[PDB]
Amino acid sequence: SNNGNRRNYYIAAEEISWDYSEFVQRETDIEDSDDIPEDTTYKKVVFRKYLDSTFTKRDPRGEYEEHLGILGPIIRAEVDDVIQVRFKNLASRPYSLHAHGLSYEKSSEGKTYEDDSPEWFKEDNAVQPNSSYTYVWHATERSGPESPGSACRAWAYYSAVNPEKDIHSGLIGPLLICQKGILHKDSNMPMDMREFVLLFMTFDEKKSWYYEKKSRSSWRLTSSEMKKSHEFHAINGMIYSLPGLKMYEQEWVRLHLLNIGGSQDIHVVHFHGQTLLENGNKQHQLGVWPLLPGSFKTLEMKASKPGWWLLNTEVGENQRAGMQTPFLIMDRDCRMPMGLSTGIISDSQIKASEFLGYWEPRLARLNNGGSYNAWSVEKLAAEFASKPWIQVDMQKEVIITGIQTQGAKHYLKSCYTTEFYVAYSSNQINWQIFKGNSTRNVMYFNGNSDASTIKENQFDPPIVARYIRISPTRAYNRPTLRLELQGCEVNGCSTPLGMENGKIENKQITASSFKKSWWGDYWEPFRARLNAQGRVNAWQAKANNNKQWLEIDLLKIKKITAIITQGCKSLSSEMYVKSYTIHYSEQGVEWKPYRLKSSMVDKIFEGNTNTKGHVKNFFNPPIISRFIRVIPKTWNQSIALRLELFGCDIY
Amino acid sequence: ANSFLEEMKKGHLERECMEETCSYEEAREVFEDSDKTNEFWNKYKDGDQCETSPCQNQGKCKDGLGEYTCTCLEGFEGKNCELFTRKLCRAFNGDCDQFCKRVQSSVVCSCARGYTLADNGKACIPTGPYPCGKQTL
Amino acid sequence: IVGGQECKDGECPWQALLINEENEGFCGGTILSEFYILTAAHCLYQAKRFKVRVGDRNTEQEEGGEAVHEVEVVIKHNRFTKETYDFDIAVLRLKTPITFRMNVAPACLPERDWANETLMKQDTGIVSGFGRTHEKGRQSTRLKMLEVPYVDRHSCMLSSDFRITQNMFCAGYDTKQEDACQGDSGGPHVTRFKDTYFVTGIVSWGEGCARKGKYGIYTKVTRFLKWIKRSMKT
């Protein structure tokens, strides 16, 4: 139990200003103004990770840490490891570090009390301002997880000069002690599951060191609302919304439900639409986990259905108070291309910092062909501080769970960005650069060994943003970038119903009619598969008239949230529908035209702009039915339709 | 420059790197040693950070491609080596070979009967042949 | 020794074998110095007269390594009783000095604090002897070894139906067919550290032999290091 790693960490209590509701007002588009406090920005101190021992070049918080908020950086070590965490008190107050369950000598406890200790190693008990120390922590077996139980365990480190007021001042952080072989050699990040450190805590500001109790001599009679105003029932110190909580569907999430709340911070962690499994020797199934002050429980919930669910304590007061952050469960196959390879994103939505010649951003089409088929820059701005970037606009808040990357050649020179990194933004002003789990400040994604071959890099956790900037850093004789960002909608229930992967059976698709090929093949309805390849792989109709339809039976009443259509290629022409409308029935006979909410005339959807361009269209209101017919209205030179329904069933 | 027969002549340090932007291949042939060229290549791109010796405790400063590193002696570690060390024989047995006895916080490697403390103060050496606790060879 | 492996040539030099009047091995021992051997207390009653053989990898044959040594002084703890097997310790000073050679080497005695705070928190010890290969079996003439993992004090007090005193620690498996059996008593329980083996325990007793649900029991040497060093001054 000695051949381990000396985990090196450098935690500095730096000074920042923390406003809890800084992510409530970013989505303020409602006529409600009664469920939020006023003047919620406060001055505090927070543990912040530093990459270097000199405490100059800070370690930025990426996306795996985006949900941390006021917590300190995550400290991790497997069993029997040695942790060296260096404190750099950057505040105007003496702090320290405490620990829970770890093996530490009295030179690393960090808590000062009447223990009658000689002072040659008391310099851990209360680190004085402007100074530094080093806390040595060993993670023995009495601090690891169970055997057999969950894969990790949760502990909470914090400043221990006066914790009852030093935690309200923002000094707190996760300390995870996992089983052997789970954390990483360098990144010191777990590899198996998705971990969500949640701090269900009340940040009563009336107790922090930086409580600006100005003179209240002139003030009206107490309204009994300001007393509770400074209390923020928040998850990770962000009320009413907390970013980063993005998990796939039917996926196991290792929830480290930390809590250092007071004697009345009873929090019944509840996930709307989810059930919690207390892993261990005896696995228990729960819907809500009644969490208690001082607890660090490591549960494992299984995602049920994609959508914007609501993480919340079930105490009624802490619901409208603000401890209810909508967590985002995403579809299981949130690998959907975002349209660069298809045509959903047109050339007018692509910009760049620079470009070389005809290698405009319009060539960011994945697997594009021709002489010029990528976004290329003659010389990478490595010498400059601003490397060239290419930008794409999604026109809406979406989810991007991954990325694809390629290159191109000038018929002899294989040019490709052997590295790059991604910066995302929503308003194209406040920019953030993706970091993921990389050791450095930014995850400089691995590039491609060859220009053509793909290199899929998964943005974990997924990026929720409208604008994406890709800035290559390395190259092979020239940068050359092709990409198709991959992800789904922020609103769930957008998984393909199965027109392409074969989940929806062939016999489920029925046609009003269909044609015959020049040799005998038919455009049968079951051949309406999305992205289907072949001479005859599209659904048609025998007669070109309004009376045609494509009936597909879902065998279960599904909630369709969107639709994507396509077109086909003939021997010497392009075949596709120009306009249509959809019809549906709960029983398969009473077909209804799809109207608007305020219109009595059927919404004639805009059909295929061209053959391959995915003409995605949405359903407001959606289609709560088992049967659906897409009735065409206009088509070019012939009728063809290989559509796909993006919805979820009813449970 | 860049004449037709520049590569045929023997390499010179001034010709390749000082009078021209030399690459890795051209600099190696002048020196013939990988270790020698690596030292010259690190300073070429990002200068010599080790010239001012930023690190402390006589750190063996090493120049790389955009980074600096100094390997320091016992009692002072890290990139800067400006801070001392908690001896803490709990980790890696205080770099000893046998028992530690915690006096004020300096790690005290010890050796029992039939054993002698080493010059560095960390290893133990048997006094005579066939000491305690060893397999016969 | 239920299961385990046979001691190789020079693999277990610290192992000293006790032979009764019939020159039949009945208990093991550990070499502390050129004159002293470490054994268990209850082994003294089994023969009432015995000799110490060292360097023997096989009791039933002579291969030039056996060395039968007479014993000068026998010293054992007074508080030791067979009712509880507490304080099960005994050291034998020989009439003749032990000639250290191939397969004949002594064993260390670590410091009291460092042994408790580091050795008693390692993973696995080492136990060896000439015990039975299975419960109610025959004491094998060959010398076997067994890697007995340490067990926390709280954990191993549960399985044993008899009280584990503070001078005793358990090592073995609550399920597996691995434990020293009858004929191993007085054998070493040494601890490895940087290829240096330190005496940690002496084989005291055990309920059965490698029963599912059970670990072997050993007597903590570190509780009597002052007693051992004082006795080594005899």
Place this chain on the structure above:
Amino acid sequence: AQLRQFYVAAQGISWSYRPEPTNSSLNLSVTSFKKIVYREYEPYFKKEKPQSTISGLLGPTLYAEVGDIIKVHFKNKADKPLSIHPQGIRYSKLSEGASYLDHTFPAEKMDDAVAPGREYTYEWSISEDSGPTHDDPPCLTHIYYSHENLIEDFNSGLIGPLLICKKGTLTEGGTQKTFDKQIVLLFAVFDESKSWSQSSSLMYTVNGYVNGTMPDITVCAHDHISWHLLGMSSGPELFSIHFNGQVLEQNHHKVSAITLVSATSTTANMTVGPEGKWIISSLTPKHLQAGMQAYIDIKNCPKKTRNLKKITREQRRHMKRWEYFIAAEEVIWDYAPVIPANMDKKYRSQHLDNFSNQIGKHYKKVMYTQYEDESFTKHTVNPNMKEDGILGPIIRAQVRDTLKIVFKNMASRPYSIYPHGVTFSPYEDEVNSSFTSGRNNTMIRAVQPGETYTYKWNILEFDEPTENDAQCLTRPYYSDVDIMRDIASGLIGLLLICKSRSLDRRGIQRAADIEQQAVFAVFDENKSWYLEDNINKFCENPDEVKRDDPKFYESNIMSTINGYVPESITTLGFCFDDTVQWHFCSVGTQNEILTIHFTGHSFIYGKRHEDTLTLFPMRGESVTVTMDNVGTWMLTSMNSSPRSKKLRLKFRDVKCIPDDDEDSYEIFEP
């Protein structure tokens, strides 16, 4: 894939919290409120299914199985928008019944609120994941409520239990094949001020019934019940459900006091004792003056399917008749016989100083004092009489062990001693004693000052700690005359219900090197029977005392550990590499949860290492600590309150010195 159809109609009723239907044809005032409650109707809303006499405000209990899908029919009969929303279901957006910023279309907003008269049948597919595990009880207990206005709507009363069950443990009669009974209690907090009536009142009720006026429940003796308990509140709350004279099993942990919090529910396998009638309650002191006390009747149904399991001869040797002789003397107990000068002076002058009007430290109390014989003439000399304080003598017992607790009452008032691990039978002692009907029914016969009784408990096979519990389980025993007024007097101990062969011949545990009790008895002498005796005998001027004064009333909550304020208790010492067993159990008027922190050390809690140990009132937790790191460390309560922060215990992890075995050896030649 079986499908079911329940019928719930949100018909608010003119409700008095005391039982209105259970009236003797008289008005009994009104005192009513316009609640909004779920009700169960005949199919297709033709008529109603009459409810039980106890269900009160609880809706129709739901029961599904793995695979089986529910379809609940709902149509509001009130004037508000309401929905139905169950915990622990993987429901969909079209039947979630929750209104928040889900970005959902108005079609899926239908479940969010139901307009009065509008109809919606919520389907809840129940897959394998939601169903109980192999280690879980058969029917998992959830709770459903309306999720339109989570605070105001519930306080009207739209609450009902949901019971997802295992695949093959349900009939069509609303019960279980494997269980001979089934009950669904409710411990909910109703705040009328937040209720839709907006009347200024706060109501803690059992099954929607206030102040213990709910009708009793009838069961059979030795009945294999499967209880289901609900906890629900809009403000944070701590339920500690206890079934007096009974022992439950919460997920194969033989708990006695099963504890819940707001918007939580639980399931417990439960085998009744003999015929009798106990008074269920929720031990949390806030709920104790609030009267969450239900009742239960155990009928002697002539069922003889099973009354014994395996009893053998080999275990009769282990059935050691332990003979404890406990008394109860009224003397002066001091939380601070000696005080360090370094301790806080300001707090010493309020809760400790013998002020002219404040008593401070020395109070009159009653305590459990052990003895060795029936004469009670010699106290048992335990080594830790000062270390463990006023905690009662540890009553160690094993399974099948026939204890004989000879309780004695030398005190000045009636008391009792109620265990937490004995299904003790009240029909064992009366033979020819006359009982009067209806006058102050104390659960145990009123032991008048100077009276003695011989309790004869029994650790049946239903009180055996299972494979997932510590060898000895800490279960407090207290005088069950009034749990409030009595534990405040200090009549608290721990009953170490050990497993078989867990005690030696003497009666000491066989797996703990040192046994240590650590009980946080948060006293309140103003809630003791001697509150008047405490003040008058120590106060110089008793004519100026006022119970209303926070400078006096709150100057009497003496938060302690084992009976001493931690600023006035000795520092512990435990030798290195031992296994100290820690006996943790909260008592007193601690309305909150007391989480404690072991500095530098950790323990074992259920095959799992933990550092902070949460504690509910009158629930005991036992952990064992291996002293494994040299130094001087601390035990502290992390709670921020000054009463709950002064609880700081100091202990040293010393290195065990001799051990003087050096001067005792014998020399003999062979």
